[PDB]
C-alpha cells in the first residue's frame, strides 16, 4: 500500500563530530606569520536557526592542536641562534653593593671568568652581572643549567609580543560557534552559527592570572569540569578588566663579547644610578569589587551561608608558585600574596604593590633538558595589562568544616588556551542521504 | 520597492528547515565539499578530502545515479526500516533527525541498490542484443 | 571543472547544449560572424565579463529540470 521507494539525495545538511587539522589565517616574531595564510577582510558567519548542538570544552581537540603548534613554533624560532656551550666555566663572583636598597641585597652577583675568542689559541678575561637565581655555588659559582644540559640564547631580533591567530578548517568540515550567553562550556547550546574561522586569539603565556584576554559580555563566569571534585581547576572569567602596571626600573646596559667566528654573547655591563626591585601595581578598590563579584558568583554553587576564603599558593616550583609572565623580553616572576588574602562572610587611590623578581634562564614549557637564555634589555622597562580571569583550586573541601578556601593555580598552558576556544567545535559534513519517495526508475 | 532587503540561505542555513524545504538547496552544499612538516599535514588533509569526494562519487555511479542530485530508484521501501508516512517525514522532520533514525539500516540499502543496478545493466544489455 | 560540468547536466559530454536562452545583451553578433570569422581566444576576451551569471542560470535551470523530471516520474 505504501509503494514507497528508496531515493538518494546528495548535498543534505548533516554533520558528525570529527577531528582534523586546521590551518592559519592572520592579518621578526616568535609566532611566525610567514607560514600562515592571510585572513579574509570580511569574515562570514551563518546563523543556524532551530539548531541546538552539544558542546564540551573539556574534550576539545583544538586545544591540543594549539598547544602542539605553539610548542613547535617556539622550537623552530630558536634553531638559527647561538648555542652557549662555552659558558660552562668556573666563575668568580662578588656581591654588588653600590647604591642598593634593603630588598635588593644579594640578588645580583658580579662574576668574572675566562672566555674563548675568535682565534682558537687565545683567551680573554671578562665579567658580567648575573642574578642570584641563575648561579649556584660550586667564591666559585656555576650556571644553574650546566649539570643538566647546554642550551641556547634567543636571537636579539625576534620579538616575544603575541600576535592574533585565526584557525580555519579544511574543505568538507565546518566550525560551529555557540552564541548563547551564560553558556558554561558544557551541555546543549540552542543558538549556533557556522564560521569559516575563529576570532584572533593572542597566545599569551602566564600563570595564576589571564592577561589580555576576552571578557564575559554579561557577568562573571565560573567553569569547572566537575565542581564537586577538588582536584579540578576552576576557570573564572571576569566581566570587566582590572588594570595592572608592571615595571623594571634599573637602567641596564648591554655589551657584546665575541666568543668565536660570528658568535656573540650579550652580557649585562653595568647599572646606571640606583638599583631597585621591579614590581607591579593593581588598584585596590577595583580588586575588592572584582573579588566581591567572584564570591557572589561562587556562592551559587557552594551554598548561600558558606564562608569563602582566599589564601596563598601551596608550594612547588617558582613557575607555579608565582604569577610568571614576560614584559618586553624580560621574564618576571611575581608574588601574588597581597591579592588572594581575605575572608568573606555571608551577610581611594592607594594600590596593592607586588614586589617581584626577574630571570634569564628559562624553561618555558614543562620540559627538562632545554633552556632559553634571554639577553638583557637596555634601559628601563614598563608595561600595562588587563586582568580578565583567574585559575583557582579548592583545597581540602571535606564536610567537617563549612569554610571554603580557594588558592591560585596554573602551570599547565592548556588551561590558557581552553578559556578562548570554549565556544567553538569542529564537525564534518555527510552529504549522502536516503529517503522514501514515490517515483520509480 | 525601495527600503527592502534580500537575503539567501547560505551553506548550512537549511539545517533546521524541514526535509522538503531543505531539498531545494542541495547545490550550495555540494559545491562546498571540494573547496616543511606542516605542509605534509596540509597535503594529507587535501588528499583525504579528494579521496572522500571520489568515494562518494564512485558510490553514486555504482548505484546508477551518476551526475544527479536527486535520483529515485527501483528498490522498494521495506516497512521494517520505517513506518512513518510521507506526511510526517517531508513536512514534520529534518534531515538530522532522519539520519539519526535510519543510521542502523544504511548498508543493506546500499547493497540492494548495487545488486539492483547490476540487474538493470544486465537486462539493458540483453535488450540491446536483440 | 568536472563538478561544474556535472552540476549543469552536461556530465560525460564534450559538446552539451542546454536550455538557457541567449540574452542579446551579452553579444549582438550573429552566428555567421562568430563561428566562421573569429577564434576562441577572441571570444573569451569578448565575453570575459558575462561568465558567472550564465553559470548561475545554468545551475538554476538544471535544478528546475531535475525537479520537473522527478515530478513527471512520480505519476
Amino acid at each position, epitope marked *: 500500500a505504501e509503494n514507497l521507494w528508496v531515493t538518494v539525495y546528495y548535498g543534505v545538511p548533516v554533520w558528525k563530530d570529527a577531528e582534523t587539522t586546521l590551518f592559519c589565517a592572520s592579518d621578526h616574531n616568535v609566532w611566525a606569520t610567514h607560514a600562515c595564510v592571510p585572513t579574509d577582510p570580511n569574515p562570514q558567519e551563518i546563523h543556524l536557526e532551530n539548531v541546538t548542538e552539544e558542546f564540551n570544552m573539556w574534550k576539545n581537540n583544538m586545544v591540543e592542536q594549539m598547544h602542539t603548534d605553539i610548542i613547535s613554533l617556539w622550537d623552530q624560532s630558536l634553531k638559527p641562534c647561538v648555542k652557549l656551550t662555552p659558558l660552562c666555566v668556573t666563575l668568580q663572583c662578588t656581591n654588588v653593593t653600590n647604591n642598593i636598597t634593603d630588598d635588593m641585597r644579594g640578588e645580583l652577583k658580579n662574576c668574572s671568568f675566562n672566555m674563548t675568542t675568535e682565534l682558537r689559541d687565545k683567551k680573554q678575561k671578562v665579567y658580567s652581572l648575573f642574578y642570584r637565581l641563575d648561579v649556584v655555588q660550586i667564591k666559585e659559582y656555576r650556571l644553574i643549567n650546566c649539570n643538566t644540559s647546554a642550551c641556547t640564547q634567543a636571537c636579539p631580533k625576534v620579538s616575544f609580543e603575541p600576535i592574533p591567530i585565526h584557525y580555519c578548517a579544511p574543505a568538507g568540515f565546518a566550525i560551529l560557534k555557540c*552564541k548563547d550567553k551564560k553558556f558554561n562550556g558544557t551541555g546543549p547550546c540552542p543558538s549556533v552559527s557556522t564560521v569559516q574561522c575563529t576570532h584572533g586569539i593572542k597566545p599569551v603565556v602566564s600563570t595564576q592570572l589571564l592577561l589580555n584576554g576576552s571578557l564575559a559580555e554579561e557577568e562573571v563566569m565560573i567553569r569547572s569540569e566537575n565542581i564537586t571534585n577538588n582536584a579540578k581547576n576552576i576557570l573564572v572569567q571576569f566581566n570587566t578588566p582590572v588594570q595592572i602596571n608592571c615595571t623594571r626600573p634599573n637602567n641596564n646596559t648591554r655589551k657584546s663579547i665575541r666568543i668565536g667566528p660570528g658568535q656573540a654573547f650579550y652580557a649585562t655591563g653595568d647599572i646606571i644610578g640606583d638599583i631597585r626591585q621591579a614590581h607591579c601595581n593593581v588598584s585596590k578598590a577595583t580588586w575588592n569589587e572584582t573579588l566581591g563579584k567572584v564570591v557572589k558568583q561562587l556562592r551559587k554553587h557552594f551554598g548561600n551561608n558558606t564562608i569563602i576564603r582566599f589564601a596563598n599558593s601551596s608550594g612547588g616550583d617558582l613557575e607555579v608558585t608565582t604569577h610568571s609572565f614576560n614584559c618586553g623580553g624580560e621574564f618576571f616572576y611575581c608574588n601574588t600574596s597581597g591579592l588572594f588574602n581575605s575572608t568573606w562572610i555571608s551577610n581611594s587611590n592607594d594600590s596593592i604593590t607586588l614586589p617581584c623578581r626577574i630571570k634569564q634562564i628559562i624553561n618555558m614549557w614543562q620540559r627538562i633538558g632545554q633552556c632559553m637564555y634571554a639577553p638583557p634589555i637596555q634601559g628601563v622597562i614598563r608595561c600595562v595589562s588587563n586582568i580578565t580571569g583567574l585559575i583557582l583550586t579548592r583545597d581540602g573541601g571535606s564536610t567537617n568544616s563549612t569554610t571554603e578556601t580557594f588558592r591560585p593555580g596554573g602551570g599547565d598552558m592548556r588551561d590558557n588556551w581552553r578559556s578562548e576556544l570554549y565556544k567553538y567545535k569542529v564537525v564534518k559534513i555527510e552529504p549522502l542521504g536516503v529517503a522514501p519517495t514515490r517515483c520509480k526508475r | *520597492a*525601495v*527600503g*527592502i*532587503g534580500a537575503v539567501f*540561505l547560505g551553506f548550512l542555513g537549511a539545517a533546521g528547515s524541514t526535509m522538503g524545504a531543505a531539498s531545494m538547496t542541495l547545490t550550495v552544499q555540494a559545491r562546498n565539499l571540494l573547496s616543511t612538516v606542516w605542509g605534509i599535514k596540509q597535503l594529507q588533509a587535501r588528499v583525504l578530502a579528494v579521496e572522500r569526494y571520489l568515494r562518494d562519487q564512485q558510490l553514486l555511479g555504482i548505484w546508477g545515479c551518476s551526475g544527479k542530485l536527486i535520483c529515485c530508484t527501483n528498490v522498494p521501501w521495506n516497512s521494517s526500516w520505517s513506518n512513518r508516512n510521507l506526511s510526517e517525514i517531508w513536512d514534520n522532520m529534518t534531515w538530522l533527525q532522519w539520519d539519526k533514525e535510519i543510521s542502523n539500516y544504511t548498508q543493506i540499502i546500499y547493497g540492494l541498490l548495487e545488486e539492483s543496478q547490476n540487474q538493470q545493466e544486465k537486462n539493458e544489455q540483453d535488450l540491446l542484443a536483440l | 571543472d568536472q563538478q561544474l560540468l556535472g552540476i549543469w547536466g552536461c556530465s560525460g559530454k564534450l559538446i552539451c547544449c542546454t536550455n538557457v536562452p541567449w540574452n542579446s545583451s551579452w553579444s549582438n553578433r550573429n552566428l555567421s560572424e562568430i563561428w566562421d570569422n573569429m577564434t576562441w581566444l577572441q571570444w573569451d576576451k569578448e565575453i570575459s565579463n558575462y561568465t558567472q551569471i550564465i553559470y548561475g542560470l545554468l545551475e538554476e535551470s538544471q*535544478n528546475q529540470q531535475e525537479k520537473n523530471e522527478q515530478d513527471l516520474l512520480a505519476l
Partner: antibody, heavy 129, light 107 residues
Framework: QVQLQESGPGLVKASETLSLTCAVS?????????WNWIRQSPGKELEWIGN????????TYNPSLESRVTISTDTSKNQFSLKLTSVTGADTATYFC?????????????????????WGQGVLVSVSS | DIQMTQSPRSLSASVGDRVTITCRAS??????LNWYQQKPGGPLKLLIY???NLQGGVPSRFSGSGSGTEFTLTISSLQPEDFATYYC?????????FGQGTKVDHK
C-alpha cells in the same frame, strides 16, 4: 530570528544632541539589510526618521529632518546609532529601531517568498527646556 | 511625499463583529503596502504584507485586499485581543508615511 534592543538617555536638554543606539542579535549589521529609525510622539502619528543600508552604508533621511539626522553603524559592537542635533520640545517621543527584508528559500530572486520584519521595544525620550 | 488617509479614525465594535478599515494613498503604490497592529504601550505587530499576503503566525481571521489607491483590512470575527490601533504603511517611495491609526476598542 532577528532581535533588536534600543538604548539611550531617557532625558535630554533643549538644543543638545540626542544619541540613541540599537543592538541587533541573530544577524550582522554589514549584511544586506535596511536598518530603520522611526519615532512616535504621544498621541500622534508615527514619523519615520531615516534609514541606512548595512552593506553599502547609503543613508536616506526624512526631508523634514534631513538637516539634523545622522545614522551610523558599528560592526565591532554589532549595532547602529542615531544622532539628532538641536532637539526641541516636539522631539519628545518613543523611538524605535526596525528592520524588514525578504528571505528567499532558493537561488536568485525568483524562488517562493518569506517576508520578515523586526521592531524593537522602543525607548521613550523627553526633551526638557 | 505620498500622503495617507485612513478611515474610520475611531471605531467601536463588540466581540465577533466584522471590522473594516480603509486606507488611501495620494498616488498608485500597489502592491506595496503593509498593515500593522499596535497594542497600548507595545510594539507594532505586522498583520499583512503586500496588502494581500497574511504574515506567518497571524490568525486567519485577518485579511487584506484592494489595489491602486485604495486598500482594505478586514477582521471577520473580532476578538478580545483585537482591540488595538491599526496602521497602513507604504514603501514604494521615500519617505515612509504611516496612517493616522484606526483605533478599535470594546463597545
Amino acid at each position: 530570528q532577528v532581535q533588536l534592543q534600543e538604548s539611550g538617555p531617557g532625558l535630554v536638554k533643549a538644543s543638545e544632541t540626542l544619541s540613541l543606539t540599537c543592538a541587533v542579535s541573530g544577524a550582522s549589521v554589514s549584511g544586506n539589510y535596511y536598518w530603520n529609525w522611526i519615532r512616535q510622539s504621544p498621541g500622534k502619528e508615527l514619523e519615520w526618521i531615516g534609514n541606512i543600508h548595512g552593506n553599502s552604508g547609503t543613508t536616506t533621511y526624512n526631508p523634514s529632518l534631513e538637516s539634523r539626522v545622522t545614522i551610523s553603524t558599528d560592526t565591532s559592537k554589532n549595532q547602529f546609532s542615531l544622532k539628532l542635533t538641536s532637539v526641541t520640545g516636539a522631539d519628545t517621543a518613543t523611538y524605535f529601531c526596525a528592520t524588514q527584508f525578504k528571505k528567499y528559500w532558493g537561488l536568485s530572486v525568483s524562488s517562493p517568498f518569506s517576508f520578515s520584519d523586526s521592531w524593537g521595544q522602543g525607548v521613550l525620550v523627553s526633551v526638557s527646556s | 511625499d505620498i500622503q495617507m488617509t485612513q478611515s474610520p479614525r475611531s471605531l467601536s465594535a463588540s466581540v465577533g463583529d466584522r471590522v473594516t478599515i480603509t486606507c488611501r494613498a495620494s498616488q498608485d503604490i500597489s502592491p506595496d503596502l503593509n498593515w500593522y497592529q499596535q497594542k497600548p504601550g507595545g510594539p507594532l505587530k505586522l498583520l499583512i504584507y503586500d496588502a494581500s499576503n497574511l504574515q506567518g503566525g497571524v490568525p486567519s481571521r485577518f485579511s487584506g485586499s484592494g489595489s491602486g489607491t485604495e486598500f482594505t483590512l478586514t477582521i471577520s470575527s473580532l476578538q478580545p485581543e483585537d482591540f488595538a490601533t491599526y496602521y497602513c504603511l507604504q514603501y514604494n517611495g521615500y519617505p515612509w508615511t504611516f496612517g493616522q491609526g484606526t483605533k478599535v476598542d470594546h463597545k
